[PDB]
C-alpha cells in the first residue's frame, strides 16, 4: 500500500500534469508548473486520486494552522510581556514579538513595560489568553505543546490518507453523514464542551482576577479548587449585553458560557430536527451541487459572511476582557476579518464560475440577461446617487453655498431605518467607560452615515455584478458562443468581433478583486474614521467626551475633500512623521513600501506581454552574442499571469499602505 510512496517523483518536477511532461522548454513551463500545483482536477489519474489529494491537502493545511497557533503560543510564553500585561493590562501594550539588534533594527522595539521592549502586537492574543484563564507560563507551554502535537497528528493523517483512501473510497461523498456528524458533534457537542471549559476554568479564574486577586493565592485558589464560588456568581440579573463587566469592560464570562451551552443545545436539537424538516425544494440544489468546486464556493461564501459578521461583532459587542479599551486591537480585529470576508467572497465567486464550467449549471442561468441587467441598472443608480451626493456637497461647498449641501446642518438625509433600529443593543441612555477610555457609546447615525452606507451598498453591488456576470456568462454568451470549450481561464478569444479581451470567468474575478478591494477600503476608512470621531477617545470627569478625531466625521465626511484632508492627510501625520520614532519606524517604512508595490503593479496592469517579449528577445540577442544561451528559453509572462501579478501587487501594496496608516496612528494615539 505505502510501498508506492516514493521520492522518485520529487526530482521529476511537473509530473502531476500531462501538459508539463514535454519538459521545461521555456520559462512559461515554470509558471504553469506553479499554476497547476493545486489544480487536482486537471492532474493525472482517476477521480479517487482527486479525493485523496483534496482531503490530505485539507489535513496538511490544518496542520499548518495548528503550527501557526503553536508559534503564537510559544511567543506568548517565552517572548512576551504577558505577565505584566496580566498584572496591569490598562498600562501595558501587548507584545509577544521582538526584533534582533541588527542593522539598528533595535529601533523597532519600543517601551511596552519597564522590563520589556518589543513590537506592540495587535492580534488580541493576550485578551484571548486572559479570557481563556491562562495565567502562568506553564499553561502557555502546555498550550504550545498541545498545538505542536496537533500539528504532528494532522501532518501524519495527511500523509496516511493518501494511501488509506483508495479507488473504492466514498466517505467524502456521504453528504448526509458529513452534515449530521459535523452539525451535532462539532457545533453542538463541542460548543457545550467549550461551555464546560469556561464554567470550570474561566468563572473559577476570571472572577478571581476581577475580584482584585491577581495574586489568586497563586495556585491555592487559581488552580481550580473553588467550588464555593457558584457558576452564576456575578450575573447581576439584567440582560446579557445591557450591563457590561465594569472591571474588564466586557460581557460577563458566565453569560458567554451560558451562550455556548445554549448554542450547543440548539445545534444538537437542529441535528435531531434534520431527521424530518423542510426539504423537496432545495432538492434540485441538493442533487446538482454535489461537486468539489460548488461546495467549495458555498463554504467560501458562508465563511466570508461569517467573517464580516465577526468583524462587526468583535468591536461593539465586547466579549474579551480589557479588549474594548485596547483600540489598536479592536481596529485590527475588525479590519482583518473585513478583508478576509472580501477575499473569501471573491473566491466563492471564482469557484462558482469553475463549477459552472466543469459541472452543469442550474435554472437561474437561462434568464441571466434580466438578472445581470437589473444588477447593472441598480449599480448605475446607486453609483450615480451615493457618490454624487459627495460630489454635490463638494461642488456646493467649494462654491461657498453650504446651505445647499447634504449635511445635518443643511438638506439632511435621515437614516430612517437605522434611527428606528434601536432594537440592537437597546442599552440604557448613557455610555460605558473603564479607565480614561470609552468602552462603547452608541454611534449616532446621521446624514454622513447614510451616505457612506449607500456607498458601501453601491460598491458591494458592483462587485456582485462582476462576480455574477462571470458566473452566468461562463459557458457561453452572445459575444462568444463556445466559451465552454475555451476552459475556465483564458486571456481572450482574439482581437475579433471588435475585441474579446477578458471574457473568461478568471478575468471576471480579476476585475472583481479590484472592485472588492475598493469596496472594503471604504469600509475600512468608514470604520477607522467613525470610531475615532464618535466612539473612541478620552473622557472628562464632568461627563464630557474628547474623542480622538474631535468629531470630524459628521462635519467633514460629507465631502470628498473632507476624506482627503481630515482622514488621509491629518490622520496620516502619525505614519508620515514616524522615522526614528521607536515603535512606528517599520510602519512608516512599510507605508513607503506599500506605495512602491502598488505603483509597481501598474507596470503589469497597463502593459501587454508582446512588448516585454520583444524586449526579452532583444536582450537574448546580447546573451547569445557572448555564448550565453539559456536553454529554458526566456518567455514573457502569459497574459493571464501578467494580470494575476498586477492584481496581487496592487492589492498587496494598497493593503500595506492602509495597514501602516491605521496601525501607526492607533499605536501613537494609544
Amino acid at each position: 500500500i505505502f510501498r508506492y510512496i516514493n521520492t522518485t517523483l520529487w526530482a521529476k518536477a511537473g509530473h502531476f500534469n500531462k501538459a508539463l511532461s514535454k519538459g521545461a522548454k521555456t520559462t512559461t513551463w515554470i509558471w504553469n508548473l506553479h499554476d497547476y500545483a493545486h489544480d487536482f482536477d486537471i492532474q493525472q489519474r482517476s477521480t479517487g486520486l482527486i479525493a485523496r489529494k483534496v482531503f490530505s491537502s485539507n489535513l496538511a493545511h490544518l496542520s499548518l494552522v495548528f503550527f501557526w497557533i503553536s508559534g503564537m503560543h510559544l511567543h506568548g510564553a517565552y517572548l512576551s510581556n504577558y505577565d505584566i500585561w496580566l498584572k496591569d493590562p490598562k498600562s501595558i501594550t501587548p507584545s509577544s514579538h521582538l526584533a534582533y539588534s541588527l542593522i539598528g533594527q533595535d529601533i523597532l522595539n519600543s517601551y511596552t513595560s519597564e522590563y520589556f521592549s518589543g513590537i506592540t502586537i495587535t492580534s488580541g492574543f493576550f485578551q484571548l489568553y486572559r479570557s481563556e484563564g491562562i495565567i502562568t507560563q506553564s499553561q502557555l507551554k502546555y498550550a504550545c505543546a498541545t498545538s505542536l502535537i496537533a500539528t504532528l497528528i494532522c501532518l501524519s493523517g495527511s500523509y496516511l490518507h493518501m494511501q488509506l483512501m483508495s479507488k473504492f473510497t466514498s466517505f467524502y461523498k456521504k453528504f448526509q453523514s458529513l452534515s449530521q456528524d459535523h452539525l451535532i458533534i462539532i457545533f453542538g457537542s463541542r460548543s457545550t464542551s467549550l461551555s464546560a471549559h469556561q464554567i470550570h476554568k474561566m468563572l473559577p479564574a476570571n472572577p478571581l482576577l476581577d475580584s482584585g486577586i491577581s495574586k489568586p493565592s497563586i495556585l491555592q485558589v487559581i488552580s481550580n479548587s473553588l467550588s464555593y464560588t457558584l457558576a452564576l456568581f456575578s450575573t447581576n440579573l439584567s440582560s446579557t449585553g445591557k450591563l457590561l463587566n465594569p472591571s474588564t469592560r466586557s460581557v460577563f464570562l458566565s453569560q458567554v458560557a451560558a451562550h455556548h451551552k445554549t448554542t450547543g443545545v440548539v445545534f444538537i436539537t437542529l441535528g435531531l430536527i434534520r431527521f424530518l424538516t423542510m426539504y423537496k425544494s432545495q432538492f434540485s440544489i441538493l442533487t446538482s451541487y454535489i461537486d468539489y468546486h460548488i461546495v467549495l464556493s458555498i463554504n467560501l461564501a458562508l465563511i466570508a459572511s461569517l467573517s464580516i459578521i465577526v468583524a462587526d461583532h468583535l468591536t461593539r459587542t465586547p466579549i474579551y476582557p480589557h479588549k474594548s479599551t485596547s483600540y489598536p486591537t479592536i481596529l485590527c480585529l475588525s479590519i482583518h476579518h473585513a478583508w478576509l470576508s472580501g477575499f473569501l467572497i471573491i473566491g466563492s465567486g471564482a469557484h462558482a464560475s469553475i463549477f459552472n464550467l466543469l459541472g452543469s449549471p442550474t435554472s437561474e442561468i437561462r434568464h441571466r440577461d434580466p438578472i445581470y441587467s437589473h444588477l447593472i441598472w441598480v449599480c448605475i443608480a446607486i453609483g450615480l446617487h451615493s457618490f454624487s451626493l459627495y460630489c454635490h456637497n463638494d461642488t456646493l461647498e467649494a462654491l461657498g453655498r453650504p446651505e445647499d449641501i447634504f449635511h445635518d446642518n443643511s438638506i439632511q438625509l435621515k437614516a430612517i431605518f437605522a434611527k428606528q433600529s434601536f432594537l440592537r443593543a437597546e442599552l440604557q441612555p448613557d455610555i460605558e467607560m473603564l479607565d480614561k477610555k470609552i468602552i462603547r457609546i452608541t454611534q449616532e447615525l446621521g446624514t454622513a452615515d447614510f451616505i457612506v452606507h449607500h456607498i458601501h451598498a453601491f460598491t458591494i453591488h458592483v462587485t456582485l455584478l462582476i462576480l455574477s456576470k462571470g458566473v452566468l456568462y461562463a459557458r457561453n454568451s452572445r459575444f462568444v458562443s463556445d466559451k465552454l470549450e475555451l476552459g475556465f481561464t483564458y486571456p481572450c478569444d482574439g482581437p475579433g468581433r471588435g475585441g474579446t479581451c477578458q471574457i473568461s470567468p478568471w478575468d471576471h474575478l480579476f476585475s472583481a478583486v479590484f472592485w472588492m478591494y475598493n469596496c472594503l477600503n471604504v469600509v475600512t476608512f468608514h470604520y477607522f474614521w467613525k470610531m475615532q470621531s464618535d466612539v473612541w477617545g478620552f473622557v472628562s470627569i464632568q461627563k464630557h467626551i474628547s474623542h480622538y478625531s474631535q468629531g470630524d466625521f459628521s462635519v467633514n465626511s460629507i465631502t470628498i475633500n473632507g476624506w482627503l484632508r481630515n482622514l488621509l492627510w491629518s490622520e496620516a501625520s502619525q505614519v508620515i512623521q514616524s522615522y526614528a520614532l521607536s515603535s512606528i519606524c517599520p510602519y512608516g517604512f512599510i507605508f513607503l513600501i506599500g506605495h512602491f508595490i502598488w505603483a509597481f503593479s501598474l507596470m503589469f496592469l497597463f502593459s501587454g506581454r508582446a512588448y516585454w517579449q520583444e524586449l526579452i528577445e532583444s536582450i537574448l540577442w546580447s546573451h547569445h552574442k557572448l555564448k550565453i544561451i539559456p536553454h529554458i528559453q526566456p518567455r514573457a509572462l502569459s497574459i493571464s499571469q501578467g494580470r494575476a501579478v498586477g492584481f496581487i501587487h496592487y492589492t498587496l501594496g494598497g493593503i500595506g499602505s492602509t495597514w501602516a496608516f491605521i496601525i501607526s496612528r492607533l499605536l501613537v494615539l494609544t
Partner: protein
C-alpha cells in the same frame, strides 16, 4: 490646498482644491480603460442593449 474649501469657509484656492479632486477623479477613471479590457464590457453592452 486641502484647507481651501472646508467647513470653515473658503479661500481663493477653492478652485485649486476642486480641480485637484477633479483631476484625481480623472486620473483614477482612466485606470478602468487601461486595466479592464474590451470583452467584459462588450458583454456588458450586450446586456444593456438587451434591456
Amino acid at each position: 490646498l486641502i484647507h481651501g474649501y472646508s467647513t470653515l469657509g473658503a479661500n481663493d484656492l477653492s478652485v485649486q482644491s476642486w480641480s485637484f479632486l477633479l483631476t484625481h477623479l480623472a486620473w483614477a477613471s482612466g485606470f478602468m480603460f487601461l486595466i479592464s479590457w474590451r470583452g467584459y464590457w462588450q458583454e456588458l453592452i450586450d446586456i444593456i442593449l438587451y434591456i
